[PDB]
Amino acid sequence: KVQIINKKLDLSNVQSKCGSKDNIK
Amino acid sequence: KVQIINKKLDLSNVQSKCGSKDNIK
Amino acid sequence: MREIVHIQAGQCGNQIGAKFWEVISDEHGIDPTGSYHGDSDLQLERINVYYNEAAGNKYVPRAILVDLEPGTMDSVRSGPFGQIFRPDNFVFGQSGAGNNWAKGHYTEGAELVDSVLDVVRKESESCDCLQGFQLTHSLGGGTGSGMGTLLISKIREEYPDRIMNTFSVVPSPKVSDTVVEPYNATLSVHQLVENTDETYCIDNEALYDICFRTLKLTTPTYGDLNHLVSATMSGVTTCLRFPGQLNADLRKLAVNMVPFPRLHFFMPGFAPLTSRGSQQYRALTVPELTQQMFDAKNMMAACDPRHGRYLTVAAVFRGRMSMKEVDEQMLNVQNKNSSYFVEWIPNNVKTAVCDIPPRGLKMSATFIGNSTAIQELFKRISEQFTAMFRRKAFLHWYTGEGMDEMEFTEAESNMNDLVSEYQQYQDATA
Amino acid sequence: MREIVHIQAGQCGNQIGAKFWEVISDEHGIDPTGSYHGDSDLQLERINVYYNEAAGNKYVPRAILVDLEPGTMDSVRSGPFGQIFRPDNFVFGQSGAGNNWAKGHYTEGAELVDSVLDVVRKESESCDCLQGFQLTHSLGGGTGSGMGTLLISKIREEYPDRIMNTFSVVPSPKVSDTVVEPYNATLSVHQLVENTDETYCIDNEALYDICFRTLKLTTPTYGDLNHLVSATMSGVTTCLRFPGQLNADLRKLAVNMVPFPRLHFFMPGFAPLTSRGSQQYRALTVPELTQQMFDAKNMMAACDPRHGRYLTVAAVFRGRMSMKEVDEQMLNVQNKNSSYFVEWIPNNVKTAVCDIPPRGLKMSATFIGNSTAIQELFKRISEQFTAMFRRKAFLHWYTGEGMDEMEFTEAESNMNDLVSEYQQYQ
Amino acid sequence: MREIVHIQAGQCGNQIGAKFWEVISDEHGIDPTGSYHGDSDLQLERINVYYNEAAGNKYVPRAILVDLEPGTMDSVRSGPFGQIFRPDNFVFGQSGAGNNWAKGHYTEGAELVDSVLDVVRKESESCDCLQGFQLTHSLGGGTGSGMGTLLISKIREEYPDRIMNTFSVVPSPKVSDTVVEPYNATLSVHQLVENTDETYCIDNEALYDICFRTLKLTTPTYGDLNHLVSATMSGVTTCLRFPGQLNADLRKLAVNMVPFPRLHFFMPGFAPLTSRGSQQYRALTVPELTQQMFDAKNMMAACDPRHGRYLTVAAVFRGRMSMKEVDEQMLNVQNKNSSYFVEWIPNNVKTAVCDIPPRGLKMSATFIGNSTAIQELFKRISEQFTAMFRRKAFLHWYTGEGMDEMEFTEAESNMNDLVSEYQQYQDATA
């Protein structure tokens, strides 16, 4: 009467941190 | 027919002796 | 430094541990008098992990002998290496277990466990840094099973942060030696799965198969099987005693090898194994040791591992070797037989290399495998136990010791749940 | 460690136990004077299991002799090893039993059992760790049957946690030695089934058949049959005295061999058995011992085990052997003949190996089987008892002492219930 | 210098003190002739604390033998060391006590106490600096009990500023040796609690347990129990005889160990204690001595100290040791088992170290504990005494010597008050 501990894992939406485009304008 | 010799002990109010504040004024 | 308290319980305990201490005393140059007469500094560099030094160049093995009848202890004391053991640690009863787990756990063990635990505390307080406890015992044996379960529970309560390792002799798939072995095994695992950190499953039948097949032995004895088990035990803790290119203590093995808290049983193996005549025709290389380790006929457990998959693999090598060679062999193993490893664990193999080879060998390796295939053992035990329990087979012998039907019921239910967990973790799921 | 108190009642029991003590004294290197003159340390290592040490390098067998007639004890005292027993433990009356179980259980036993129990208590207080009581007696003899039932009840009441083992001589299927054998046997079983832990059923008929067919003996005596029975008795408890690769004491035997508390009657066996001339023609191996043990012609109980199934099998081996050899032989036996074992018990055989063989042999093995076929013996006894009781045959001899018809009726009901239980589990 | 007058009274007195003088003469190199034949200057540096030197290299032990029947004294005089004792100090009567405290205290002791006190004054006037009096006697014995109470009262009146130490054999909890032992013990303590400075409680039953259990002795004798008691006695006053890193005389022990004037009973202990065979498997370290001392099975008193709490602990060590080691062990003891010490006494343990070890040992230690658990002894004595007194059991044997019911009543009331005081001082109160 057991069930495996499986979780739905996702890194859904991760943005970059280095502002490599901040001076693109 | 005995009782333990327990006393209520306290150093109630003890003031300092060195006049470290005598010339504070 | 790190110290290991070896607890011996039962007939398996006493015999296997007598052979084990013979092997350990040979490796460290300790003659049957306890006086050091070795030839290398590394023998005394980590002599304190299994020995206590009483001034006078005498070393005492940090071992505790437990039994319920003094016969086996008399046989041990009168045999070789009898005088090295300090006689303080021969703690025995008088009634015996009669192969009844209920008796040994609730009456005789209940009477003797206070003395045994006092001895354990005495040996533990004298330690510098207690690392873990090693228990040698059988499951089918009432003394072994009951006394071991009781002692493991009590010591786990006493030291909840130490490593609890057990080397258990498991029931054989064909030839059982005890009528009430299934009940003893069920009630034993019902506590081992809760209190122990890891358990190595040894089957005597697999050892007989290895002896007749590989070593070409015609008259194998329980002592020679104990020699094999002791070689395995010495290979397990070779990193606690000698330096090497890559060391691994007991806690590292417990961390790398137990993925989930309840799936801690392991299948041990050993290499190399050759008959005396065939030694002159086979070279000792790392590929040879690797092929001997990952072989179904060399598994000391009562199960063909090719029926399930592995979760974790530990391979501790001994002797001067090339790490590139070992790593390439492990890569070849994982690549050619990828279907035998669970998909949810990349890098399934853990490795370690000690620079000191066993006595007489250029190189060796000890195998430790955590395979889902071991569910066959637990399923067969559950089937036999259920069939016996439906007819209340020998049930009065256990109910007379204080057990009720509810304890057997809970043990069987937990066993079914453990089998179901092993089956659950065979799903790739990805 | 553990100790055994040997109790020896009846004429049959006295003779069997005399031969048994001769064999035991031979195994431990003890001459008829009691002084130890052996050659191995293991003889003295566990000499306390059967002997008390009376200072002076002499050892006294911890035996108690019981009878209602002094003739057998006179023969024991006058015969060889007659001085080996301390004369304190010869407890005998003067009336005799006359093969009347009612007499020996209610009047003469009621008079003598107090002295018997006082001797038993004195011998038990000298024990460091008392393990079990052994009773050697026949079921037909009035003294044997009555004294055995009464003394077993009394000792079970005094020591409820000790092991009560009995070696009983059972009635023969063809030739009776006593006309009133059925009443005595029924009334004896009616108490043995309640108070004892295990009973070994040895029939003299099977002993004659074995010693004639196998040993090729032409003039067998009670001494030879007692020698076989004593070899079996010594093989039963060889593990309590000598070390071995796998030891099993009385408690493990009682646990493994009795699946349900009432089904505790067993058929003993022994191997190897050979004639003198044939000894030079057959090699002594573990397969040979296994083949001789699991054979209907070598069963010392007059009952073909192939007519039923086994509940459990005990096989204690003696001498140096390979564990894998014995294991493979037992596996082959269970696999080839799986139809003779109950489906609700896997791993039917429990084994043990003692490293000391009997004197003169390289190896041996003692067989202890719990076969459901003994329902044949019990049904024969019940049928003959009913045939005699329906006509009040010899009933007045039992009624005059104090027994009533209700006791015989309850004994018959209990016997038939035991037969029905054996039939249920087959 | 400081001198100790050893007074021997009763059978316990005579036997225990004969063994004690054997041990003391061995430690100082005094052969059975009284002539010094030792090998170290420290043997004669403080030889005068227990010996008087009569010119001719002969030394006489400053001991006084007291009894009421000459049999035990004849046995002592005819045995070993008979000729060293100056025969002036064999002071005995003729009637014996018959185990009746009333007799020995009011008639026979009343007749012999004048001679005994004259001998005491003779030995005391010859001293340079009288330090204290040591009395060896039993409580159950009528001679011991009565003569000791009378002598202690008289000497306390004579020298009120000296140390009055007694080593008393107390009744056993299970096996009593005298029918009238409870009354003798009650009437004895009724005076000991008033006149003595400190009393060490020795039970023969605890000594038997130690002998069968620790020393693995099969045939222990009263003489070997006396050897243990004498080792304890020699360890108590090792600082009065030999130098050391930290010394402590008898008055220092009395000050540090008696918190309140009536709670002066102590539980003695000794370490190390090993069987002959086990000596080759155990090293002698300060942790080993510390663990052996603070062990319930090594207490020579008839009480498990784990039932109450300690007030003061004295631990006098012998042999070359590290003070840091001893102090760390004492800290570990006080920290791990803080629940066994009264909260109103910080720093419960007093220590001392003598540089001279006992004969044949590298190191040893003598334990002296003041535990409230000893109330069990006094409570059992009061219960048994009350049960016997309700029926006037053997009362005529004491009323025929001049005692009335009021003396027994006052003794029992004082005993109940002492038990109540011990119970009162188990309250943490903070």
Ligand SMILES: Nc1nc2c(ncn2[C@@H]2O[C@H](COP(=O)(O)OP(=O)(O)O)[C@@H](O)[C@H]2O)c(=O)[nH]1
């Ligand atoms: N490998 C090995 N197994 C043994 C040895 N002795 C006994 N065994 C096994 O242990 C089981 C017997 O249980 P045991 O521990 O002797 O009974 P206990 O007294 O109740 O603990 C049997 O199944 C044997 O196969 C030995 O020396 N080596």
Ligand SMILES: Nc1nc2c(ncn2[C@@H]2O[C@H](COP(=O)(O)OP(=O)(O)O)[C@@H](O)[C@H]2O)c(=O)[nH]1
């Ligand atoms: N095995 C064996 N059986 C015996 C011996 N002597 C007598 N018997 C059996 O015992 C029965 C006779 O009963 P017995 O004990 O002599 O009568 P009792 O004196 O009233 O006890 C017969 O059936 C015999 O077969 C013997 O020495 N050995």
Ligand SMILES: Nc1nc2c(ncn2[C@@H]2O[C@H](COP(=O)(O)OP(=O)(O)O)[C@@H](O)[C@H]2O)c(=O)[nH]1
């Ligand atoms: N430890 C020890 N105790 C003893 C010895 N002799 C007697 N006793 C104890 O002293 C008690 C006997 O009292 P005893 O002094 O002989 O009688 P008294 O003549 O009235 O003084 C018994 O309880 C014994 O246990 C001995 O040599 N050693």
